[PDB]
Amino acid sequence: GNGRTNNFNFADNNGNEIMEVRTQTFYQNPNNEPIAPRDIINQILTAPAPADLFFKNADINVKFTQWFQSTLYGWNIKLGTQTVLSSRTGTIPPNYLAYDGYYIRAI
Amino acid sequence: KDGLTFRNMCNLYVFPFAEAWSLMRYEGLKLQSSLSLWDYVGVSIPVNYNEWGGLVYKLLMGEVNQRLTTVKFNYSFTNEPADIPARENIRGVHPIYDPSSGLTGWIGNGRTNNFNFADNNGNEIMEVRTQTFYQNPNNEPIAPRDIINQILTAPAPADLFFKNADINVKFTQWFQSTLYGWNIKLGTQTVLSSRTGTIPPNYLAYDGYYIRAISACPRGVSLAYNHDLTTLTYNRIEYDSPTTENIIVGFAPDNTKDFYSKKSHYLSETNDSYVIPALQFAEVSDRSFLEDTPDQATDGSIKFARTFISNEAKYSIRLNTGFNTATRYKLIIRVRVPYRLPAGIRVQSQNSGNNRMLGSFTANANPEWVDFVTDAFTFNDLGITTSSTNALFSISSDSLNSGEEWYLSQLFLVKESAFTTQINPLLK
Amino acid sequence: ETDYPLYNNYTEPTIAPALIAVAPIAQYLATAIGKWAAKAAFSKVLSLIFPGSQPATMEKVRTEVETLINQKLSQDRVNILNAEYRGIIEVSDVFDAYIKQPGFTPATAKGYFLNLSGAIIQRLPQFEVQTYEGVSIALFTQMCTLHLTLLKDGILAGSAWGFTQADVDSFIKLFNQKVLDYRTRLMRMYTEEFGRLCKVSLKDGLTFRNMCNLYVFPFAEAWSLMRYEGLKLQSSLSLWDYVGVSIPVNYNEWGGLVYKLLMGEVNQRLTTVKFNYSFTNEPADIPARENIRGVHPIYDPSSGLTGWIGNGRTNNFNFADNNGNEIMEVRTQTFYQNPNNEPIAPRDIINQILTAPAPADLFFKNADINVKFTQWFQSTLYGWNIKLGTQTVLSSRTGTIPPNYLAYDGYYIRAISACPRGVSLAYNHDLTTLTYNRIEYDSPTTENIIVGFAPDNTKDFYSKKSHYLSETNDSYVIPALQFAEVSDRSFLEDTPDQATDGSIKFARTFISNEAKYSIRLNTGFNTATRYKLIIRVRVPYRLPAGIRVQSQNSGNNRMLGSFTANANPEWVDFVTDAFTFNDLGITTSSTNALFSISSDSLNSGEEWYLSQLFLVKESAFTTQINPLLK
């Protein structure tokens, strides 16, 4: 798909490669008091193979939502016993990907 | 900064005596100075003398008859390069006096991002923080980089005014490039502690003075524009510049503390002489400019150059309890009239429609300063008592022509008994 | 869709404002306000409203109103209204026929007069059904005009029509009651329909207000001048053309922000207008599109009050107004390269600031602004065409767009503004004043242009900045908004019933509240003639200092009047004592003469309203119906 995380062209340079970019925005309303900081995160999740070379199962799922004729998404990613991504948009039901007598070879 | 230092010296050692010279021919007037002392903290910026009297001083004063109610700073911090140490920038200053007027604007830059989402969706933007993370295979420590752009806000204290400040700036060199660090504290409110390390304090205080204005100077931009537009009212008092990197604090003597608190000149029976500076007015006409006349021992004078309707300036007067209204008084007006005015100058007393004419003076061409003395009057003839809250003294003149102007400096109110001219000015 | 030319958003040209069906009624109303003909004005009003005892003119009025406001009436409602018309016509014919007989019996005339008044009162409410109010508010108006006229004449011809003194007093009381009740009900209908249509869309509310400015409000103002004799009946309302998309506007938002943005500097001439234009066709599938991002009307070049109505930004480099010269246009051209194909389609992205200064004759007389819509996968694309006068400001790059002629015979373009789109309009209400505070509102786009046309009777003020007086004329009317200078914390209040573009609301709690007007005298003006001033004010809260009218002339300040201000929610007229221009020290060479209406400072939450000034000779002025006898 797309491995880019920003528009500064500073992806893989200066020795260490970029991993995560988090922008937090704060507002101020005179008539109100609660402050809702807005988060914008763009990161690269990494998952190496287990000690036994192969993953045996996975728990990957996606949740849909509608909002004024526009579909919003939420993701849940887990390979083996390593939780790769828990959904920030609320709990998502698990989707067990497994076949007795099979192992994960490609993703 | 050096010019401000020299002017601060002259305000204490030179100009008060120059003003005292102009009052030796009379007897009974009050010798009072209202000049301000200006502290400058930041980098060096060259300023022409045409640019000082046409823009810089107007930006330093702002609303010349209003109390400072809020001050906002545009703060920027960044350490994205791993080799360059952390740095801080002051991008703009916004002093807010009258909350319902909207005259003073940003002196530097009020922008925080390039999304154009500054003041929208009800709540205005306040802070933007970007945190960047890296990953090195050969190393293990991770140094997250921070980029912060925020708007610091400081309202006036409970006692309306700040008495002192602790603002300082620290310089650093790095491959022929200067990095900065800032420390800002107004009164007891810590506005900004430096993230680039500890910075020694710089106490800004003068015994007998209080903080009246906080402004800045534009850096990196031409200061030769909007001279004829920067007036005392109507037009927006602002100037766009990417950064300022400087903060200027004005201290005013305590003899002006009552005006910026009560918005009116209160009169006591015990005192004999009263001096009213021109800039301490209730309202002023359009197309009026602030002229730097430091020799008058005041923060300036009013230059009228409006070629329509009229040129008028009003001052609010209030009487304390125990004031005798049967005592005779006189008014002295200090004006400079380079061009002849066929209608002359007029001093009028307005009180809830009880408008009385105090004086009409023939205005002839004269490049020097002139004093006009009115006839004797009593406060019973003006219909003013201890309960009057809309009494006004109005100095007015007709409309001018193109290229013409006339200057008003100060007003002197003194009892008839204690006033006497000793040296005649007409015998030249 | 339609590619035919348009005429002020209508498919066929509209009737001139002086050629509408209610024009002779208004002309004779003004003539009678100038000098009322006793026991004869009602017959003329009846002949003008019902010519030949026929309701054909009222049907023409109904058809014209239905054409303007895009609202038609059912046939049953038409039959009911015509039946009411004939019912009134019968009694009116009886009365008018019995009057003209030389030597009639006055008691019989009294009986017929009472019958006619009662019949009009009885049949009035048929035009007050709110479900059709937007169409009937015009018709209703004329009917009230037929009644308030009647009573008026009845008060003048007392014993001639068999009226005792108690009869005349009762008629005066009924007149003083009805002249308020009718105005209240008419304003109810107007405000209801206007708020509803504005909650629908701003364009429809503007259309309804344009209709009411020609068919409703002038007569409502004429009602408030029938008790006097010698004043001038003059309307200064503006006609507003709206071109663009639909934007809902609340009634709290109209009177607190939108109208203030439409007027701008209410006493200044338009000198320049700037538009923020955006064009782009970067996607190869989506056709070209154009956007109006903001409008900036500049009146007084040395003031700096009016700001951008939409968005004046052109890029995200923050390099807008810097390095001496300001940015004007940014054009990005992108090129591609396909191996399987050969044609190359360069993509253009333009963001510029179009500038249009006022013509040599200070004002634009007409405009040709139009917008074209397009659909594409449930997304609306726009194209714009802008032309002010003879200067082509913007020709559409997205294809030809049919012209939309914006013109009114007897009107000229005075203001050009816009409405913010996509943002809340509930902020900066208490800050948007007539002066000092910046008249602006930030919004990413507007996608709308609003042009205001003002009648030619105001063309002299916006050119000479002063009110010139002639010896030949008898009465002069000065609107409040045509001032020389105004105090702080003053607001623009929409009072369309005054036949003016608004009134001044004073709410300053310090110093004073003052408004000055500049007066100049033409050669041949008699300074020995006696005059009087009439001030129209609304004072909801008591003012212990009262209102004061003063004459200031180069320091020769004289007091013309001091009036006690008591709490009154209705409109009040204050008349000064007689004076001559020699007592004011004003001649044909005076260029700094000023009339000042002033009051002391107010308290929190208080305000008072000033509407208009009337200057009339003492000989030609006389109050006929007493207002205090309520």
Numbering used by the authors:
A (entry chain A): 323 to 429
B (entry chain A): 216 to 643
C (entry chain A): 14 to 643
How do the authors describe this structure?
Cyt1Aa, Cry11Aa, and co-crystallized Cry4Aa and Cry4Ba. These are produced during sporulation and are remarkably stable in a variety of conditions, but dissolve after ingestion under the high alkaline pH levels characteristic of the larval mosquito midgut. Solubilized protoxins are activated by insect gut proteases enabling binding to gut cell membranes, subsequent oligomerization, and ultimately gut cell lysis leading to larval death. Cry11Aa and Cry11Ba structures maintain the three-domain organization characteristic of Cry δ-endotoxins.
We first tampered with the interface enabling the brick-wall packing of Cry11Aa tetramers (interface #2) by introducing a F17Y substitution, intended to induce electrostatic repulsion with the negatively charged D180 (distance D180(OD1)—F17(CZ) of 3.3 Å) due to deprotonation of its hydroxyl group upon pH increase. As expected, crystals of the F17Y mutant were found to be more sensitive to increases in pH, with crystals starting to dissolve at pH as low as ~9.5 and an SP50 of 10.6 ± 1.0. The dissolution profile of F17Y crystals is again characterized by a reduced slope, as compared to WT crystals, explaining that the plateau is nonetheless reached at the same pH (~pH 11.6). Nevertheless, the result suggests that dissolution of Cry11Aa crystals can be accelerated by separation of the tetramers associated through interface #2. We note that F17, D180 and the H-bond between them are strictly conserved in Cry11Ba; hence, the importance of interface 2 for crystal formation and dissolution could be extendable to crystals formed by Cry11Ba. To evaluate the significance of these changes, we characterized the distribution in size of crystals of Cry11Aa-WT, Y449F, F17Y and E583Q using AFM. All three mutants had a significantly reduced volume compared to WT Cry11Aa, due to a reduced thickness of the crystals. The structures of the other three mutants were determined, using the WT structure as a molecular replacement model for the phasing of diffraction data. We found that neither overall packing, tertiary structure nor interface formation is affected in the tested mutants at neutral pH.
